[PDB]
């Protein structure tokens, strides 16, 4: 049972079979292990997963439906599209069985690796000491020309009216695998050697031996009554790729698979996941290798994806919220954490409803005159609270996922990659369990009632927010003088220490002690919606605007105009002169929009897969390899809608409907302006801009 001090680089699923049994299955995992010198080696481990653990990571399906995902070992190449959460489940459950049976496992980190020479399988893993092998990076540029018939690519969206077209593209490539066979492909894998490859048709004719090493290892898995040989591709001098045609990578790796696994031996899984694999897309890009090749492909800095990989064992974002804790083991932690809280806080956690008025705020629309406004925040308080409460409910379910969460929480303040992961994971685990919605609502309610209670005593008056982000007026300061930094400092310390004391008093223990940020000191503020607030500092003409949509470039120019307009408008300290300044700003905006009356990309808005939008022109269905970049947002101009990205460049368009787009923008600017006029000068008059009367003609 030999121990080698090494450093796993990737963990990837090789095979998934069921022994002479009925209610559980096994998996065989592939390890990319490297010595202190970098010298690569290839080891394996075996794991068992029960029906219940699978259902837990799925959120109930059946293990015969996760072993007929041993049709992935052929040329049926996009098997996850059939059932994506099944694969997210199977991979998260294997990564839990592996730590629960082989022990702690940490990508890129010094490790102690056992074995069983009778069998060759890794049996145990532990930590160790040594200055580990630096992950080397390989660059990858790849392009492919898949010939998908663009009438088949429209039938899919005929069935799925919101389908992102990277998904329709993949679904077609799934319904006729042979499209990836006759497909041009160019690849250029730089590895500090060089691997270019022409492929006029990818089924026909640097060295593929200086890029990978083909290794065959003999294994005797307990799940098999026979010795079975695993053939792998061990990277040399690189540990991951950095790159996006998802079908380009799919067909490339599918060629590699068909070639390597030609002769008699055992055949890997070949499964990939990405946002292109869901019908409605998914906001963030990633390409999850969880199968044949054996190592990742970070589709981008890059130290960010590398570190996220290493910290969450590579399952993020592939597996989703299953990184931290199974889906159907969240109700237990929710209830358990709920029980540990003080009964006042528990009544809060039980009567949380999303739309509640917990703190009295400035009722919109209203403005705050020359005061000392301050705008605070607790950086990432929802992630800290989720981690802390998951701990506090731990005894309702192991804790390795929660340790990953805790690493992401201690790392967020200093590294932004951790912050990104948190901002994407906290929402999505709540989406997987609503009792988490309510627990977080309750504890945030308690954290708002304090802050209110403390602000009563620290010359602060909460004027708006949510409890991790809030702002208010120091209605004791002299509207002047340098004795304003001192009071804001005292207030920030008092609220930091009070919120910390409250969270302790409920047995919620925070990874790293709260810091109350001061995100700016202002002197005027106007509030026009729930989310809409503009701030301004008269001492130094600095501002902040929040609540305006930024749906395209037109909207960022508009937001700049609204900010400059509000600066002048609050420089007037009647209402009519304000309206003059506002209509002057809108006039100048429409004229400068006329100068950009041809720039289609500027007037394009981004439309989610949920907000109903313009239908697709059939001409967009044959945009070729640009549909494959459409995973979340569709960028549309308009009257008939144009998806400006499903067409080659440069566009050849009728005039862009600048009146439609300026009408939208003017409606939002008019919300802002009605708010400011009502709030500061008490006008009941909704601000309206005459567009159809003046300036309509410019776009007729």
């Amino acid at each position: 049972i030999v121990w080698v001090e090494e450093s796993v680089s990737a963990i990837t699923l090789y095979a998934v079979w069921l022994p002479p049994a009925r209610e559980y299955f096994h998996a065989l995992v592939y390890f990319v292990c490297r010595n202190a010198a970098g010298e690569g080696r290839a080891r394996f481990a075996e794991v068992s997963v029960t029906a219940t653990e699978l259902r837990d990571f799925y959120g109930s399906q059946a293990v015969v439906a996760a072993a007929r995902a041993a049709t992935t070992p052929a040329a049926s190449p996009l098997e996850p599209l059939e059932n994506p959460t099944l694969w997210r489940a199977l991979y998260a459950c294997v990564l839990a069985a592996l730590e629960r049976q082989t022990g702690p496992v940490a990508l890129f980190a010094p490790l102690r690796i056992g074995s069983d020479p009778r069998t060759g399988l890794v049996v145990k893993v532990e930590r160790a000491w040594g200055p580990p092998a630096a992950p080397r990076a390989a660059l990858l540029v790849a392009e492919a020309n898949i010939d998908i018939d663009p009438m088949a690519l429209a039938a899919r969206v005929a069935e799925h009216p919101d389908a992102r077209l990277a998904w329709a593209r993949l679904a077609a490539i799934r319904d006729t695998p042979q499209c990836a066979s006759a497909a041009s492909l160019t690849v250029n894998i730089t590895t500090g050697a060089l691997f270019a490859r022409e492929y006029q048709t990818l089924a026909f004719p640097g060295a593929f031996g200086d890029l990978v090493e083909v290794c065959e290892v003999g294994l005797r898995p307990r799940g098999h009554p026979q010795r079975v040989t695993a053939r792998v591709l061990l990277p040399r001098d690189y540990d991951y790729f950095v790159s996006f045609s998802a079908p380009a990578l799919v067909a490339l790796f599918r060629q590699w698979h068909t070639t390597v696994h030609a002769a008699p031996a055992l055949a890997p899984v070949f499964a990939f996941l990405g946002p292109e694999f869901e019908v409605r897309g998914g906001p963030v890009p990633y390409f999850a290798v969880l199968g044949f090749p054996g190592w990742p492909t970070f589709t981008v800095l890059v130290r960010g994806a590398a570190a996220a990989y290493a910290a969450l064992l590579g399952a993020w974002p592939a597996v989703g919220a299953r990184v931290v804790l199974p889906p159907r083991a969240w109700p237990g932690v929710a209830s358990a954490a709920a029980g540990c809280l003080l009964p006042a806080v528990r009544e809060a956690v039980a009567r949380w409803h999303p739309a509640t008025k917990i703190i009295q705020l400035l009722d919109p629309p209203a403005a705050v005159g020359p005061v000392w406004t301050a705008r605070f925040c607790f950086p990432g308080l929802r992630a800290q609270l989720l981690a802390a409460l998951a701990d506090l409910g731990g005894s309702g379910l192991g804790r390795t996922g929660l340790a990953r969460l805790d690493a992401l929480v201690v790392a967020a303040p200093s590294e932004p990659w951790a912050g990104a992961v948190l901002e994407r994971l906290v929402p999505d685990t709540c989406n997987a369990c609503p009792a988490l919605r309510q627990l977080l609502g309750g504890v945030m309610a308690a954290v708002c009632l304090q802050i209110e209670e403390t602000a009563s005593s620290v010359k602060f008056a909460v004027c708006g927010g949510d409890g991790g982000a809030f702002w208010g007026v120091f209605n004791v300061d002299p509207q002047d003088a340098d004795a304003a930094s001192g009071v804001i400092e005292d207030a920030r310390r008092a609220i930091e220490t009070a919120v910390g004391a409250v969270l302790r008093a409920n047995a919620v223990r925070l990874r790293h002690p709260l810091c109350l940020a001061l995100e700016g000191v202002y002197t005027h503020a106007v509030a026009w919606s729930q989310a809409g607030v503009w701030f301004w500092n008269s001492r130094d003409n600095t501002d902040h605007l929040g609540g305006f949509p930024l749906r395209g470039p037109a909207y960022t120019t508009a937001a700049g105009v609204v900010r400059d307009t509000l600066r002048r408008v609050l420089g007037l300290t009647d209402a009519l002169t304000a309206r003059g300044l506002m209509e002057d700003a809108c006039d100048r905006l429409i004229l400068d929009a006329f100068n950009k009356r041809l720039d289609a990309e500027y007037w394009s808005v981004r439309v989610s897969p949920f907000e109903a939008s313009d239908p697709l022109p059939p001409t967009a269905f044959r945009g070729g390899a640009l549909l494959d970049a459409e995973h979340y947002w569709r960028r549309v101009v308009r009257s008939v809608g144009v998806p400006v990205d499903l067409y080659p460049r440069p566009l050849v368009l009728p005039p862009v409907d600048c009146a439609h787009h300026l009408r939208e923008i003017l409606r939002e600017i008019e919300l802002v302006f009605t708010g400011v006029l009502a709030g500061v000068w008490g006008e009941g008059g909704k601000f309206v801009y005459p567009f159809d009367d003046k300036m309509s003609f410019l776009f007729a």
Binding site: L591, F594, N595, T619, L651, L653, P654
Partner: protein
């Protein structure tokens, strides 16, 4: 009066564009600065109705990133590459906006012609007086000189050269006031009487033009009004006497809209019907009094251009020389520049766009 009529029955809306937006507007909504400058031969898109529908269907097959008298009138843009019309015209140095024409064909049928440039001498050489002939015509009174100068005068891709109607494109601005006179008359009319009646048309209409365009130095003496009378100098014309009056829009203005120009025409109509001199000089010949078809400015509608017959009165000039004109050779020569008789021509700091009258 007329001040009263344009005080009650017209509501100007103007928008003072300025600086570079002025140049952009002019270039964007008028014909290109070479669409009406002459050229050795035409680069255009001329065919019958059916072949034009086909050639459009074939330019659609190369204009796949978006989307027959709306569609031709639609096909305008430029960018920093060749415009979208170039798929139909089939050059790469086309420039837009550019004219679109409706062409009556013997024996029947209609053809259309969107052309980036044409040979305007081939059209208007057998009507052009030599600079010397003018400068030696020696005739002091301007009624006299105008009348004598008027006395002097003398396949789809070929039929465009005898019948050519210009299509109003409401996308575009209007830089000329193209009136379409259709005087119906009971007893025939001499030509000195008509010429003096037109000298009284211009004066009243210029008063109307000055009321409608207040910040414009439209001197009612030297402001050019270009008259073309259809041939039928003996008039010889019984029943109907077709004129065509073209006035530059005054200096800082441009007109936008079909309804705006319908309004301008109707105001000019009422102003010239309120001139007591005009209706004496022309009355007792003229049955009706509706001298101006204000409904010819609608999008998609066509007006026969000067120097073109009908399928045959060539609209040939009647030089109603301005009182107190300054450079008579130039005024005579302008009855030949196409810019002075197309709706959407280039104008010859700020501009104001009269986009509504009511």
């Amino acid at each position: 009066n007329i001040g009263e009529y344009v005080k009650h029955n017209v509501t100007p809306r103007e928008t003072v564009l300025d600086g570079d937006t002025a140049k952009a507007y002019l270039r964007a909504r008028t014909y290109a600065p070479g669409a009406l400058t002459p050229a050795p031969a035409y680069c255009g898109a001329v065919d019958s109705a059916t072949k034009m529908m086909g050639r459009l269907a074939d330019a659609e097959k190369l204009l796949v990133p978006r989307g027959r008298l709306l569609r031709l009138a639609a096909t305008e843009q430029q960018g920093p590459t060749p415009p979208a019309i170039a798929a139909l015209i089939r050059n790469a140095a086309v420039q837009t906006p550019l004219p679109v024409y409706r062409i009556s064909m013997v024996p029947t049928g209609q053809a259309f012609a969107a052309l980036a440039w044409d040979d305007w001498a081939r059209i208007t050489r057998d009507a052009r007086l030599a600079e010397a002939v003018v400068s030696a015509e020696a005739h002091p009174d301007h009624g006299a000189l105008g009348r004598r100068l008027t006395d002097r005068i003398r396949d789809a891709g070929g039929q465009m050269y005898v019948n050519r109607n210009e299509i109003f494109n409401g996308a575009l601005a209007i830089t000329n006031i193209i009136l379409d006179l259709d005087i119906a008359l009971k007893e025939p009319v001499p030509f000195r009487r008509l010429h003096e009646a037109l000298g009284h048309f211009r004066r009243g209409a210029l008063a109307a033009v000055q009321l409608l365009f207040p910040a414009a130095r439209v001197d009612p003496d030297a402001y050019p009004c270009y008259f073309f009378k259809s041939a039928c100098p003996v008039c010889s014309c019984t029943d109907k006497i077709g004129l065509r009056v073209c006035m530059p829009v005054p200096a800082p203005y441009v007109v936008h809209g079909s309804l705006t120009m319908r309004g301008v025409a109707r105001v000019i109509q009422q102003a010239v019907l309120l001139d007591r001199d005009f209706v004496e000089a022309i009355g007792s010949y003229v049955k009706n009094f509706l001298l101006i078809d204000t409904g010819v400015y609608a999008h998609g509608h066509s007006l026969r251009l000067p120097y073109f017959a009908k399928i045959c009165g060539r609209l040939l000039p009647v030089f109603v020389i301005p009182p107190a004109c300054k450079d008579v050779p130039a005024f005579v020569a302008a009855h030949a520049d196409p810019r002075r008789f197309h709706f959407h021509a280039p104008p010859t700091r700020e501009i104001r766009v009269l986009h509504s009258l009511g």
